[PDB]
JSON list of N, CA and C in Angstrom, two decimals:
[
{"chain": "A", "resi": 1, "resn": "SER", "atom": "N", "xyz": [-10.33, 87.48, -54.47]},
{"chain": "A", "resi": 1, "resn": "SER", "atom": "CA", "xyz": [-11.51, 86.92, -53.75]},
{"chain": "A", "resi": 1, "resn": "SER", "atom": "C", "xyz": [-11.43, 87.27, -52.26]},
{"chain": "A", "resi": 2, "resn": "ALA", "atom": "N", "xyz": [-10.65, 86.54, -51.51]},
{"chain": "A", "resi": 2, "resn": "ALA", "atom": "CA", "xyz": [-10.53, 86.84, -50.05]},
{"chain": "A", "resi": 2, "resn": "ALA", "atom": "C", "xyz": [-9.07, 87.16, -49.69]},
{"chain": "A", "resi": 3, "resn": "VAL", "atom": "N", "xyz": [-8.72, 87.05, -48.44]},
{"chain": "A", "resi": 3, "resn": "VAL", "atom": "CA", "xyz": [-7.32, 87.35, -48.02]},
{"chain": "A", "resi": 3, "resn": "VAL", "atom": "C", "xyz": [-6.66, 86.10, -47.44]},
{"chain": "A", "resi": 4, "resn": "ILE", "atom": "N", "xyz": [-6.80, 84.98, -48.11]},
{"chain": "A", "resi": 4, "resn": "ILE", "atom": "CA", "xyz": [-6.19, 83.72, -47.59]},
{"chain": "A", "resi": 4, "resn": "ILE", "atom": "C", "xyz": [-5.64, 82.88, -48.75]},
{"chain": "A", "resi": 5, "resn": "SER", "atom": "N", "xyz": [-5.30, 81.64, -48.48]},
{"chain": "A", "resi": 5, "resn": "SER", "atom": "CA", "xyz": [-4.75, 80.73, -49.54]},
{"chain": "A", "resi": 5, "resn": "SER", "atom": "C", "xyz": [-4.29, 79.42, -48.90]},
{"chain": "A", "resi": 6, "resn": "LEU", "atom": "N", "xyz": [-3.91, 78.47, -49.70]},
{"chain": "A", "resi": 6, "resn": "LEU", "atom": "CA", "xyz": [-3.46, 77.15, -49.15]},
{"chain": "A", "resi": 6, "resn": "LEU", "atom": "C", "xyz": [-2.11, 77.29, -48.45]},
{"chain": "A", "resi": 7, "resn": "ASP", "atom": "N", "xyz": [-1.46, 78.41, -48.62]},
{"chain": "A", "resi": 7, "resn": "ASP", "atom": "CA", "xyz": [-0.15, 78.63, -47.95]},
{"chain": "A", "resi": 7, "resn": "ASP", "atom": "C", "xyz": [-0.30, 79.71, -46.86]},
{"chain": "A", "resi": 8, "resn": "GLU", "atom": "N", "xyz": [-1.48, 80.24, -46.72]},
{"chain": "A", "resi": 8, "resn": "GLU", "atom": "CA", "xyz": [-1.71, 81.28, -45.68]},
{"chain": "A", "resi": 8, "resn": "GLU", "atom": "C", "xyz": [-3.01, 80.97, -44.92]},
{"chain": "A", "resi": 9, "resn": "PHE", "atom": "N", "xyz": [-3.42, 79.73, -44.90]},
{"chain": "A", "resi": 9, "resn": "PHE", "atom": "CA", "xyz": [-4.68, 79.37, -44.18]},
{"chain": "A", "resi": 9, "resn": "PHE", "atom": "C", "xyz": [-4.40, 78.99, -42.73]},
{"chain": "A", "resi": 10, "resn": "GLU", "atom": "N", "xyz": [-3.17, 79.07, -42.30]},
{"chain": "A", "resi": 10, "resn": "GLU", "atom": "CA", "xyz": [-2.85, 78.73, -40.89]},
{"chain": "A", "resi": 10, "resn": "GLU", "atom": "C", "xyz": [-2.98, 79.98, -40.01]},
{"chain": "A", "resi": 11, "resn": "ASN", "atom": "N", "xyz": [-3.62, 81.01, -40.52]},
{"chain": "A", "resi": 11, "resn": "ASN", "atom": "CA", "xyz": [-3.78, 82.26, -39.74]},
{"chain": "A", "resi": 11, "resn": "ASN", "atom": "C", "xyz": [-5.14, 82.27, -39.01]},
{"chain": "A", "resi": 12, "resn": "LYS", "atom": "N", "xyz": [-6.20, 81.91, -39.69]},
{"chain": "A", "resi": 12, "resn": "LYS", "atom": "CA", "xyz": [-7.53, 81.93, -39.02]},
{"chain": "A", "resi": 12, "resn": "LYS", "atom": "C", "xyz": [-7.92, 80.54, -38.50]},
{"chain": "A", "resi": 13, "resn": "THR", "atom": "N", "xyz": [-8.52, 80.50, -37.36]},
{"chain": "A", "resi": 13, "resn": "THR", "atom": "CA", "xyz": [-8.95, 79.20, -36.75]},
{"chain": "A", "resi": 13, "resn": "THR", "atom": "C", "xyz": [-10.28, 78.73, -37.35]},
{"chain": "A", "resi": 14, "resn": "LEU", "atom": "N", "xyz": [-10.29, 78.41, -38.62]},
{"chain": "A", "resi": 14, "resn": "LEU", "atom": "CA", "xyz": [-11.56, 77.93, -39.28]},
{"chain": "A", "resi": 14, "resn": "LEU", "atom": "C", "xyz": [-12.79, 78.70, -38.77]},
{"chain": "A", "resi": 15, "resn": "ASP", "atom": "N", "xyz": [-12.83, 79.99, -38.96]},
{"chain": "A", "resi": 15, "resn": "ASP", "atom": "CA", "xyz": [-14.03, 80.76, -38.50]},
{"chain": "A", "resi": 15, "resn": "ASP", "atom": "C", "xyz": [-13.97, 82.21, -38.98]},
{"chain": "A", "resi": 16, "resn": "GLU", "atom": "N", "xyz": [-12.80, 82.78, -39.02]},
{"chain": "A", "resi": 16, "resn": "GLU", "atom": "CA", "xyz": [-12.68, 84.19, -39.48]},
{"chain": "A", "resi": 16, "resn": "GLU", "atom": "C", "xyz": [-13.05, 84.32, -40.96]},
{"chain": "A", "resi": 17, "resn": "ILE", "atom": "N", "xyz": [-13.20, 83.23, -41.66]},
{"chain": "A", "resi": 17, "resn": "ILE", "atom": "CA", "xyz": [-13.52, 83.33, -43.12]},
{"chain": "A", "resi": 17, "resn": "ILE", "atom": "C", "xyz": [-14.30, 82.10, -43.62]},
{"chain": "A", "resi": 18, "resn": "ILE", "atom": "N", "xyz": [-14.77, 81.25, -42.75]},
{"chain": "A", "resi": 18, "resn": "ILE", "atom": "CA", "xyz": [-15.51, 80.02, -43.22]},
{"chain": "A", "resi": 18, "resn": "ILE", "atom": "C", "xyz": [-16.97, 80.36, -43.54]},
{"chain": "A", "resi": 19, "resn": "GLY", "atom": "N", "xyz": [-17.72, 79.40, -44.02]},
{"chain": "A", "resi": 19, "resn": "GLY", "atom": "CA", "xyz": [-19.15, 79.65, -44.39]},
{"chain": "A", "resi": 19, "resn": "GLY", "atom": "C", "xyz": [-19.37, 79.24, -45.85]},
{"chain": "A", "resi": 20, "resn": "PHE", "atom": "N", "xyz": [-19.32, 80.18, -46.75]},
{"chain": "A", "resi": 20, "resn": "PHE", "atom": "CA", "xyz": [-19.52, 79.86, -48.20]},
{"chain": "A", "resi": 20, "resn": "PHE", "atom": "C", "xyz": [-18.16, 79.60, -48.84]},
{"chain": "A", "resi": 21, "resn": "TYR", "atom": "N", "xyz": [-17.24, 80.53, -48.73]},
{"chain": "A", "resi": 21, "resn": "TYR", "atom": "CA", "xyz": [-15.88, 80.30, -49.29]},
{"chain": "A", "resi": 21, "resn": "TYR", "atom": "C", "xyz": [-15.36, 78.96, -48.76]},
{"chain": "A", "resi": 22, "resn": "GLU", "atom": "N", "xyz": [-15.95, 78.49, -47.69]},
{"chain": "A", "resi": 22, "resn": "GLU", "atom": "CA", "xyz": [-15.55, 77.20, -47.09]},
{"chain": "A", "resi": 22, "resn": "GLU", "atom": "C", "xyz": [-15.74, 76.06, -48.08]},
{"chain": "A", "resi": 23, "resn": "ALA", "atom": "N", "xyz": [-16.91, 75.89, -48.61]},
{"chain": "A", "resi": 23, "resn": "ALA", "atom": "CA", "xyz": [-17.13, 74.78, -49.58]},
{"chain": "A", "resi": 23, "resn": "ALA", "atom": "C", "xyz": [-15.88, 74.58, -50.46]},
{"chain": "A", "resi": 24, "resn": "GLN", "atom": "N", "xyz": [-15.29, 75.66, -50.91]},
{"chain": "A", "resi": 24, "resn": "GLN", "atom": "CA", "xyz": [-14.05, 75.55, -51.76]},
{"chain": "A", "resi": 24, "resn": "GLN", "atom": "C", "xyz": [-12.80, 75.56, -50.88]},
{"chain": "A", "resi": 25, "resn": "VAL", "atom": "N", "xyz": [-12.94, 75.92, -49.64]},
{"chain": "A", "resi": 25, "resn": "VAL", "atom": "CA", "xyz": [-11.78, 75.94, -48.71]},
{"chain": "A", "resi": 25, "resn": "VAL", "atom": "C", "xyz": [-11.75, 74.61, -47.93]},
{"chain": "A", "resi": 26, "resn": "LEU", "atom": "N", "xyz": [-12.87, 74.22, -47.38]},
{"chain": "A", "resi": 26, "resn": "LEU", "atom": "CA", "xyz": [-12.95, 72.94, -46.62]},
{"chain": "A", "resi": 26, "resn": "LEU", "atom": "C", "xyz": [-12.81, 71.77, -47.59]},
{"chain": "A", "resi": 27, "resn": "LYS", "atom": "N", "xyz": [-13.55, 71.78, -48.68]},
{"chain": "A", "resi": 27, "resn": "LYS", "atom": "CA", "xyz": [-13.42, 70.67, -49.66]},
{"chain": "A", "resi": 27, "resn": "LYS", "atom": "C", "xyz": [-12.01, 70.71, -50.24]},
{"chain": "A", "resi": 28, "resn": "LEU", "atom": "N", "xyz": [-11.37, 71.84, -50.12]},
{"chain": "A", "resi": 28, "resn": "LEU", "atom": "CA", "xyz": [-9.99, 72.00, -50.62]},
{"chain": "A", "resi": 28, "resn": "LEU", "atom": "C", "xyz": [-9.01, 71.58, -49.51]},
{"chain": "A", "resi": 29, "resn": "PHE", "atom": "N", "xyz": [-9.15, 72.11, -48.31]},
{"chain": "A", "resi": 29, "resn": "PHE", "atom": "CA", "xyz": [-8.25, 71.69, -47.19]},
{"chain": "A", "resi": 29, "resn": "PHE", "atom": "C", "xyz": [-8.25, 70.17, -47.12]},
{"chain": "A", "resi": 30, "resn": "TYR", "atom": "N", "xyz": [-9.39, 69.60, -47.35]},
{"chain": "A", "resi": 30, "resn": "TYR", "atom": "CA", "xyz": [-9.49, 68.13, -47.31]},
{"chain": "A", "resi": 30, "resn": "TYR", "atom": "C", "xyz": [-8.83, 67.54, -48.56]},
{"chain": "A", "resi": 31, "resn": "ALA", "atom": "N", "xyz": [-8.79, 68.30, -49.63]},
{"chain": "A", "resi": 31, "resn": "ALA", "atom": "CA", "xyz": [-8.14, 67.80, -50.88]},
{"chain": "A", "resi": 31, "resn": "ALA", "atom": "C", "xyz": [-6.63, 68.03, -50.80]},
{"chain": "A", "resi": 32, "resn": "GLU", "atom": "N", "xyz": [-6.23, 69.11, -50.18]},
{"chain": "A", "resi": 32, "resn": "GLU", "atom": "CA", "xyz": [-4.78, 69.41, -50.03]},
{"chain": "A", "resi": 32, "resn": "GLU", "atom": "C", "xyz": [-4.30, 68.77, -48.73]},
{"chain": "A", "resi": 33, "resn": "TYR", "atom": "N", "xyz": [-4.95, 69.07, -47.64]},
{"chain": "A", "resi": 33, "resn": "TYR", "atom": "CA", "xyz": [-4.55, 68.46, -46.34]},
{"chain": "A", "resi": 33, "resn": "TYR", "atom": "C", "xyz": [-5.38, 67.19, -46.08]},
{"chain": "A", "resi": 34, "resn": "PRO", "atom": "N", "xyz": [-4.80, 66.05, -46.34]},
{"chain": "A", "resi": 34, "resn": "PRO", "atom": "CA", "xyz": [-5.52, 64.77, -46.12]},
{"chain": "A", "resi": 34, "resn": "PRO", "atom": "C", "xyz": [-5.67, 64.48, -44.62]},
{"chain": "A", "resi": 35, "resn": "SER", "atom": "N", "xyz": [-6.55, 63.59, -44.27]},
{"chain": "A", "resi": 35, "resn": "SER", "atom": "CA", "xyz": [-6.76, 63.26, -42.83]},
{"chain": "A", "resi": 35, "resn": "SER", "atom": "C", "xyz": [-7.08, 64.53, -42.04]},
{"chain": "A", "resi": 36, "resn": "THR", "atom": "N", "xyz": [-8.33, 64.73, -41.70]},
{"chain": "A", "resi": 36, "resn": "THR", "atom": "CA", "xyz": [-8.72, 65.95, -40.94]},
{"chain": "A", "resi": 36, "resn": "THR", "atom": "C", "xyz": [-7.71, 66.23, -39.82]},
{"chain": "A", "resi": 37, "resn": "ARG", "atom": "N", "xyz": [-7.15, 65.20, -39.24]},
{"chain": "A", "resi": 37, "resn": "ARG", "atom": "CA", "xyz": [-6.14, 65.40, -38.16]},
{"chain": "A", "resi": 37, "resn": "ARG", "atom": "C", "xyz": [-4.96, 66.22, -38.69]},
{"chain": "A", "resi": 38, "resn": "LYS", "atom": "N", "xyz": [-4.33, 65.76, -39.74]},
{"chain": "A", "resi": 38, "resn": "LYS", "atom": "CA", "xyz": [-3.19, 66.53, -40.31]},
{"chain": "A", "resi": 38, "resn": "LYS", "atom": "C", "xyz": [-3.71, 67.78, -41.01]},
{"chain": "A", "resi": 39, "resn": "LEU", "atom": "N", "xyz": [-4.95, 67.76, -41.42]},
{"chain": "A", "resi": 39, "resn": "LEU", "atom": "CA", "xyz": [-5.53, 68.95, -42.10]},
{"chain": "A", "resi": 39, "resn": "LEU", "atom": "C", "xyz": [-5.71, 70.07, -41.07]},
{"chain": "A", "resi": 40, "resn": "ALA", "atom": "N", "xyz": [-6.16, 69.72, -39.90]},
{"chain": "A", "resi": 40, "resn": "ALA", "atom": "CA", "xyz": [-6.35, 70.73, -38.83]},
{"chain": "A", "resi": 40, "resn": "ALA", "atom": "C", "xyz": [-5.00, 71.28, -38.37]},
{"chain": "A", "resi": 41, "resn": "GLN", "atom": "N", "xyz": [-3.94, 70.57, -38.64]},
{"chain": "A", "resi": 41, "resn": "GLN", "atom": "CA", "xyz": [-2.58, 71.04, -38.22]},
{"chain": "A", "resi": 41, "resn": "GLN", "atom": "C", "xyz": [-2.19, 72.30, -39.00]},
{"chain": "A", "resi": 42, "resn": "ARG", "atom": "N", "xyz": [-2.59, 72.39, -40.25]},
{"chain": "A", "resi": 42, "resn": "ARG", "atom": "CA", "xyz": [-2.24, 73.59, -41.06]},
{"chain": "A", "resi": 42, "resn": "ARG", "atom": "C", "xyz": [-3.29, 74.68, -40.85]},
{"chain": "A", "resi": 43, "resn": "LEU", "atom": "N", "xyz": [-4.52, 74.30, -40.69]},
{"chain": "A", "resi": 43, "resn": "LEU", "atom": "CA", "xyz": [-5.60, 75.30, -40.48]},
{"chain": "A", "resi": 43, "resn": "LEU", "atom": "C", "xyz": [-5.67, 75.73, -39.01]},
{"chain": "A", "resi": 44, "resn": "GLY", "atom": "N", "xyz": [-4.74, 75.29, -38.20]},
{"chain": "A", "resi": 44, "resn": "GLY", "atom": "CA", "xyz": [-4.74, 75.68, -36.75]},
{"chain": "A", "resi": 44, "resn": "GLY", "atom": "C", "xyz": [-6.12, 75.43, -36.15]},
{"chain": "A", "resi": 45, "resn": "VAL", "atom": "N", "xyz": [-6.42, 74.21, -35.80]},
{"chain": "A", "resi": 45, "resn": "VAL", "atom": "CA", "xyz": [-7.76, 73.91, -35.22]},
{"chain": "A", "resi": 45, "resn": "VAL", "atom": "C", "xyz": [-7.72, 72.64, -34.38]},
{"chain": "A", "resi": 46, "resn": "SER", "atom": "N", "xyz": [-8.81, 72.31, -33.74]},
{"chain": "A", "resi": 46, "resn": "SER", "atom": "CA", "xyz": [-8.85, 71.08, -32.90]},
{"chain": "A", "resi": 46, "resn": "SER", "atom": "C", "xyz": [-9.30, 69.89, -33.74]},
{"chain": "A", "resi": 47, "resn": "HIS", "atom": "N", "xyz": [-8.83, 69.81, -34.96]},
{"chain": "A", "resi": 47, "resn": "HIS", "atom": "CA", "xyz": [-9.21, 68.69, -35.87]},
{"chain": "A", "resi": 47, "resn": "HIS", "atom": "C", "xyz": [-10.71, 68.39, -35.81]},
{"chain": "A", "resi": 48, "resn": "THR", "atom": "N", "xyz": [-11.13, 67.55, -34.90]},
{"chain": "A", "resi": 48, "resn": "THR", "atom": "CA", "xyz": [-12.58, 67.19, -34.82]},
{"chain": "A", "resi": 48, "resn": "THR", "atom": "C", "xyz": [-13.43, 68.42, -35.11]},
{"chain": "A", "resi": 49, "resn": "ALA", "atom": "N", "xyz": [-13.06, 69.54, -34.55]},
{"chain": "A", "resi": 49, "resn": "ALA", "atom": "CA", "xyz": [-13.83, 70.78, -34.81]},
{"chain": "A", "resi": 49, "resn": "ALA", "atom": "C", "xyz": [-13.79, 71.09, -36.31]},
{"chain": "A", "resi": 50, "resn": "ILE", "atom": "N", "xyz": [-12.62, 71.07, -36.89]},
{"chain": "A", "resi": 50, "resn": "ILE", "atom": "CA", "xyz": [-12.49, 71.35, -38.35]},
{"chain": "A", "resi": 50, "resn": "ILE", "atom": "C", "xyz": [-13.38, 70.37, -39.13]},
{"chain": "A", "resi": 51, "resn": "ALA", "atom": "N", "xyz": [-13.30, 69.10, -38.80]},
{"chain": "A", "resi": 51, "resn": "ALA", "atom": "CA", "xyz": [-14.12, 68.08, -39.51]},
{"chain": "A", "resi": 51, "resn": "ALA", "atom": "C", "xyz": [-15.60, 68.38, -39.34]},
{"chain": "A", "resi": 52, "resn": "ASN", "atom": "N", "xyz": [-16.09, 68.37, -38.13]},
{"chain": "A", "resi": 52, "resn": "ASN", "atom": "CA", "xyz": [-17.55, 68.65, -37.90]},
{"chain": "A", "resi": 52, "resn": "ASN", "atom": "C", "xyz": [-18.01, 69.84, -38.75]},
{"chain": "A", "resi": 53, "resn": "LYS", "atom": "N", "xyz": [-17.24, 70.91, -38.75]},
{"chain": "A", "resi": 53, "resn": "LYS", "atom": "CA", "xyz": [-17.65, 72.09, -39.56]},
{"chain": "A", "resi": 53, "resn": "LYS", "atom": "C", "xyz": [-17.93, 71.67, -40.98]},
{"chain": "A", "resi": 54, "resn": "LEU", "atom": "N", "xyz": [-16.96, 71.16, -41.68]},
{"chain": "A", "resi": 54, "resn": "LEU", "atom": "CA", "xyz": [-17.22, 70.75, -43.09]},
{"chain": "A", "resi": 54, "resn": "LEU", "atom": "C", "xyz": [-17.78, 69.33, -43.16]},
{"chain": "A", "resi": 55, "resn": "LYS", "atom": "N", "xyz": [-17.92, 68.68, -42.04]},
{"chain": "A", "resi": 55, "resn": "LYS", "atom": "CA", "xyz": [-18.51, 67.32, -42.06]},
{"chain": "A", "resi": 55, "resn": "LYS", "atom": "C", "xyz": [-19.95, 67.45, -42.56]},
{"chain": "A", "resi": 56, "resn": "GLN", "atom": "N", "xyz": [-20.64, 68.45, -42.06]},
{"chain": "A", "resi": 56, "resn": "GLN", "atom": "CA", "xyz": [-22.04, 68.68, -42.51]},
{"chain": "A", "resi": 56, "resn": "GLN", "atom": "C", "xyz": [-22.06, 69.32, -43.91]},
{"chain": "A", "resi": 57, "resn": "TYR", "atom": "N", "xyz": [-20.94, 69.82, -44.38]},
{"chain": "A", "resi": 57, "resn": "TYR", "atom": "CA", "xyz": [-20.91, 70.45, -45.74]},
{"chain": "A", "resi": 57, "resn": "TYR", "atom": "C", "xyz": [-20.95, 69.36, -46.81]},
{"chain": "A", "resi": 58, "resn": "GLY", "atom": "N", "xyz": [-20.65, 68.15, -46.45]},
{"chain": "A", "resi": 58, "resn": "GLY", "atom": "CA", "xyz": [-20.66, 67.03, -47.44]},
{"chain": "A", "resi": 58, "resn": "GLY", "atom": "C", "xyz": [-19.23, 66.53, -47.64]},
{"chain": "A", "resi": 59, "resn": "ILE", "atom": "N", "xyz": [-18.36, 66.78, -46.69]},
{"chain": "A", "resi": 59, "resn": "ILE", "atom": "CA", "xyz": [-16.94, 66.32, -46.81]},
{"chain": "A", "resi": 59, "resn": "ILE", "atom": "C", "xyz": [-16.56, 65.47, -45.60]},
{"chain": "A", "resi": 60, "resn": "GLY", "atom": "N", "xyz": [-15.36, 65.64, -45.10]},
{"chain": "A", "resi": 60, "resn": "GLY", "atom": "CA", "xyz": [-14.92, 64.84, -43.92]},
{"chain": "A", "resi": 60, "resn": "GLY", "atom": "C", "xyz": [-14.90, 63.36, -44.29]},
{"chain": "A", "resi": 61, "resn": "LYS", "atom": "N", "xyz": [-16.03, 62.71, -44.25]},
{"chain": "A", "resi": 61, "resn": "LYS", "atom": "CA", "xyz": [-16.08, 61.26, -44.60]},
{"chain": "A", "resi": 61, "resn": "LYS", "atom": "C", "xyz": [-16.94, 61.04, -45.85]}
]
């Protein structure tokens, strides 16, 4: 599919591959990485930024 994974998602700052694959990546980061705060720690991001992105996707809260 793409060039990432739950063990290699700390390379892109939630943008080099987000959008559609996100629904399964963001809904997944939130399923694998609980608490957007600790979730942003693996996805290398400013947390709130990571949340807002998939917050409108139907996740986050």
